[PDB]
Design a protein around this nucleic acid. Structure first.
Lengths: 151, 187, 51, 138, 71, 135, 103, 57
RNA sequence: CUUUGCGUGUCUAACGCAAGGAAGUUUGAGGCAAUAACAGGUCUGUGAUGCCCUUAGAUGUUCUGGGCUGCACGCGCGCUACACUGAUGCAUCCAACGAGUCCUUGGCCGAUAGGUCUAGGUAAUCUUGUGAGUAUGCAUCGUGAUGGGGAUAGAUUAUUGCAAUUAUUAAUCUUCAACGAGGAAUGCCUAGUAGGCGCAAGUCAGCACGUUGCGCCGAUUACGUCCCUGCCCUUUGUA
């Protein structure tokens, strides 16, 4: 017995919200390598991504998927900044014998990836307006690869 | 229409035996075991729920595993797939035949005629025999996989098939006959 | 020289205006009221308890 | 233009489903219903489509805007708001006799009613609402 | 209790062994075999790509559950 | 194939993954063992029962002198040595002898903290009316 | 005179004190027939203190649940400031803090 | 083995703790029996002993 | 309004069940709380106070330092655990109660903590729609006290304060114990309730494993009873 149901019409593939968000990051992480532009940090050996986390990340392309995730997240909420992105990648720290609490994300790694997008000029200030935003060239970089992944 | 997970149809199939009939709620039916609704204001709204909902509802234990119905939906959705894999027919017809045979027939109550705590033979109601059936199904499956590196879904699928069967390997079908050991003597 | 430490913060800094007692000091909204003192005069201030 | 807008309520969730004449597209904020994780409850949202049918909904479109509650409570708000929309869509424009069919087939299956279970307040001398701590004795 | 590497004696058998069985899980590999569950995942991932066997359901991230291919 | 092992005068076990096998060495743990595995160019998919002669020789060099391979100092165990006065990494039975030095330093100095080690009570200032009772 | 805009704040503890003022000052405006909008009722800022009932520790640990309530309400106008001073100055209430504001 | 019997009417509620409940049955004849759980009129239940009548009360 | 229907009753007071309805246990949950008292507790909440004590070699007051945290061992409320319905690493996207003259966005520096330069807020306007965590999706781990468990212990970097040692905390690396579902006893609880999962406020310079409120995920089992443990009213016995 196969699975039932559709929507009434076959779903339009145009904008980025129609794409499933995990499957977007699978493609665009590979796009960052094969293009070449974006550029590596020095510190990649260290990190782990948060004060709360007790271990480093397993996957060696943890930076590209993070820079993939943050760039689409500008399209979801236009106006946001570094203390904003500390909240969105928050997590349960384990205090020890004590009960559990929230904690904020790492500020170095989350700021650096934005500065590399500023060098190309996909996400930019906003010097007077509080919080970063994606530009015109930022959208067409996103929306051209939205149609590709479903195809 | 109405199918569980969309891969099964409530339509068709049948109750196994007389008694425990109408107490069970099939027939109409909801895709997905889950339903948040009011079932505990009267004392026989408990047998309006379909028993797949009562399985996923009572599958959460103990203190650590309570809640998270969404989690118990998954492992039952895998369990009904495995039941289908062996002795394939209908997961529901095998599950309905399991909870038919699962619960105990008779029980020992304490009636002393003043002073003593003395046992006496009493037959079990149709509702309690369904209540005890789904409880005893799970507590076998949970205990079976508690320390073993075997997925709970595996234990549940295995436990249900065994209950339909007369193997007696199960925790449930043993604990039927363990009560019926003493309930024979208390006559 | 004498008769003063730094007295700026902590329970030693501040006392109940009505009864001069530091303990049980309600400082929500800047009351500065010792609790024994606060409960009996609470209706006269404005606070009326319900549910 | 043909317009009705409708709301559902599970717990503290609320979900304003605007609906209009159009192509046949049902959307939350600006997703498809195809997403809506948890995915397991994805089937739950499609409940008014499966009962009523596809060929009724293709004359219209629905656009839902959701806040409050949690993960599971947001699905039940959307569940109600889609079902309440297409029932209420008749009253204004489409024939009033077919409301009695389309409503009561769903009622035969609380898709418009909204169950008012809300969180009872905590009381002193205990952790939970009705629960109390522990008495010691000797 | 269990053997951690492939054991390349049993690799020649393991082409024959698993497509016989009705249930194919994490557990059924270390049932037939006496090795840790982890190999079983990379075994049935290898038997997807190279070999015969097929998914019961499209997928899940916790309980795998394959059938024999029947061919 | 090699069941059982020994690196840096401490018995590393087989039947374990290479990152977690290295925590069986005293004065190594989970986050630094990843940095050892990454900068030795060992595959973490491989098992610790294998480990060729190239792989172990790199790990001993990094464990001895982690300042050479650009580990930036806060990762180290005995950070600032308080004898020669450098950023130092203590591994294996060196860490046993360093603990024997540092405790018996404080006994000669006659701190309060040193007398807690001498009597064998709790050091960090914990309420030992009820807790740490049995001994 | 000039085209101005005035939005007068009202706050008190009682409900009954403000419902005098809201009814009176709109009818006081409708003497002169200014451009009135109705009184915009903001959300209620309920203040809360919970102290223990007992002075000392003895008995069961019972608690008061004290409450204030504060009622921000806003009469809207479009009129010059010389006109409004007649309306506000007559009919001042006992224990009701009121503050007139242009824009 | 087990032979089915239909409830005519609940008679009372029995025992010290009051959990066990007393029922008139009819085979499928009548006699009085004790039963455990929640039971109502218009209900059918299996008995292993077709004999063995419970005390009236 | 227990309205309507049918049962149940001197058919009086009123119960039960079914339909309808947002809601039918007095619709749910609290506040308020009588007469008698008890040698209950509080002179350490008070300018509420009798009497006694002592009043300059002080039990007034105040300053420097220590102590309340001191440990052969009993007892009481809690927290985290023992794992694979799980732990870990990545990604997805959802709450309500507050609270601020301190709460903190924005940009640079820093693995982290945190700092630095601007900046809005007397607050439905700013922090904030406080992107909370159980949850969901995709990977690695494999039943080993293991990566479950994070006590015990050395060494370093910041933060509050006038001062951190008996370590105020927060971080970074190590160190890697007991504990494999808890003996006899015994507590809490009937539907958004139990349990679990966080958040906020009170005390606060700094410190929550505590209390008081708030939501989220959301079951099992009764709808009875006087057997245990108490309670209320009659008749009855009492030295």
């Amino acid at each position: 017995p196969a699975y039932l149901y559709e929507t009434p019409l076959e779903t339009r593939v145009h904008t980025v919200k129609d794409v499933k968000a995990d499957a977007f990051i699978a493609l665009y992480a590979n796009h960052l390598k094969k293009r070449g532009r974006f550029q590596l940090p020095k510190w990649i050996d260290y990190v782990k991504t948060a004060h709360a986390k007790e271990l480093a990340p397993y996957d060696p392309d943890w930076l590209y998927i993070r820079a993939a995730a943050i760039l689409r997240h500008l399209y979801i909420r236009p106006d946001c900044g570094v203390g904003g992105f500390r909240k969105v990648f928050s997590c349960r720290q384990r205090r020890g014998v004590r009960p559990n609490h929230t904690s904020k994300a790492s500020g170095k790694i989350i700021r650096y990836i934005l500065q590399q997008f500023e060098e190309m000029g996909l996400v930019e200030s906003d010097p007077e307006k509080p919080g970063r935003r994606l530009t015109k060239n930022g959208q067409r970089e996103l929306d051209v690869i939205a149609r590709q992944c479903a195809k | 229409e109405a199918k569980l997970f969309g891969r099964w149809s409530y339509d068709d199939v049948n109750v196994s035996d007389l008694s425990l009939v109408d107490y069970i709620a099939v027939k109409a039916c909801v895709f997905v075991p889950h339903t948040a609704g009011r079932y505990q204001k009267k004392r026989f709204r408990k047998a309006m729920c379909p028993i797949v909902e009562r399985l996923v509802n009572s599958m959460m234990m103990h203190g650590r595993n309570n809640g998270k119905k969404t989690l118990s939906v998954r492992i039952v959705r895998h369990a009904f797939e495995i039941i289908h894999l062996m002795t394939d027919k209908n997961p529901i017809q095998v599950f309905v035949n399991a909870v038919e045979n699962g619960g105990p027939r008779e029980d020992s109550t304490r009636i002393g005629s003043a002073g003593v705590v003395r046992r006496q033979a009493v037959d079990v109601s149709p509702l309690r025999r369904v209540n005890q059936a789904i409880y005893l199904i799970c507590t076998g499956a949970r205990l079976a996989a508690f320390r073993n590196i075997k997925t709970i879904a595996e234990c549940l699928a295995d436990e249900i098939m065994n209950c339909a069967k007369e193997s007696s390997n199960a925790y449930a079908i043993k604990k039927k006959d363990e009560i019926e050991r003493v309930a024979k003597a208390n006559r | 020289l004498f008769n003063t430490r730094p007295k700026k913060f902590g329970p030693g800094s501040r006392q109940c205006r009505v009864c001069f007692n530091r303990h049980g000091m309600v400082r929500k909204y800047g009351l500065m009221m010792c609790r024994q003192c606060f409960r009996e005069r609470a209706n006269q201030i404005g606070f009326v308890k319900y549910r | 233009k043909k317009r009705v807008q409708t709301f559902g309520r599970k717990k503290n969730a609320v979900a304003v489903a605007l609906c209009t004449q159009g192509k046949g597209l049902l959307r939350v904020n600006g997703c498809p219903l195809e997403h809506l994780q948890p995915e397991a409850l994805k089937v739950k949202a499609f409940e008014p489509l499966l009962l009523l049918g596809k060929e009724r909904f293709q004359d219209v479109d629905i656009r839902v805007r959701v806040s409050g509650g949690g993960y599971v409570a947001q699905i039940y708000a959307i569940r109600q708001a889609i079902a309440k929309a297409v029932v209420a869509f008749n009253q204004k424009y489409v024939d009033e006799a077919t409301k009695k069919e389309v409503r009561d087939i769903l009622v035969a299956y609380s898709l418009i009613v909204a169950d008012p279970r809300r969180c009872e307040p905590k009381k002193f001398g205990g952790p939970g609402a009705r629960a109390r701590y522990q008495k010691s004795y000797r | 209790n269990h053997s951690v590497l492939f054991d390349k004696a049993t690799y020649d058998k393991l082409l024959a062994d698993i497509p016989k069985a009705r249930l194919i899980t994490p557990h059924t590999v270390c049932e037939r075999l006496k090795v840790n569950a982890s190999l079983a995942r990379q075994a049935i991932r290898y038997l997807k790509d190279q070999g015969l066997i097929k998914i019961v359901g499209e997928h899940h991230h916790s309980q795998y559950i394959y059938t024999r291919n029947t061919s | 194939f090699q069941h059982i092992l020994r690196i840096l005068n401490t018995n590393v076990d087989g039947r374990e993954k290479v990152v977690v096998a290295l925590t069986a060495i005293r004065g190594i743990g989970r986050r630094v063992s990843n940095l050892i595995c990454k900068k030795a160019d060992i595959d973490t998919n491989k098992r610790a029962g294998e480990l060729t002669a190239d792989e172990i020789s790199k790990v001993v060099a990094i464990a001895s002198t982690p300042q050479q391979f650009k580990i930036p100092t806060w990762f180290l165990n005995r950070q600032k040595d308080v004898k020669d006065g450098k950023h130092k990494h203590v591994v294996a039975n060196g860490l046993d002898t360093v603990w024997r030095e540092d405790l018996e330093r404080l006994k000669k100095m006659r701190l309060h903290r040193g007398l807690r080690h001498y009597w064998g009570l709790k050091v960090r200032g914990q309420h030992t009316k009820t807790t740490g009772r049995h001994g | 005179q000039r085209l101005h805009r005035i939005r007068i704040t009202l706050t008190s503890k009682d409900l009954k004190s403000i419902e005098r003022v809201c009814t009176e000052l709109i009818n006081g405006a409708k003497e002169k027939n200014l451009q009135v909008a109705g009184p915009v009722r903001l959300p209620v800022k309920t203040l809360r203190i919970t102290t223990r009932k007992s002075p000392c520790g003895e008995g069961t640990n019972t608690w008061d649940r004290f409450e204030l309530r504060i009622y921000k309400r806003l009469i809207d106008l479009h009129s010059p400031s010389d006109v409004v001073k007649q309306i506000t100055s007559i009919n001042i209430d006992p224990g009701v803090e009121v503050e007139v504001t242009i824009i | 083995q087990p032979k089915l019997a239909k409830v005519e009417k609940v008679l009372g509620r029995t025992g010290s703790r009051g959990g066990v409940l007393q029922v008139r049955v009819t085979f499928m004849r009548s006699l009085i029996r004790n039963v455990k759980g929640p039971v109502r009129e218009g209900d059918i239940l299996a008995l292993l002993e077709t004999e063995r009548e419970a005390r009236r009360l």
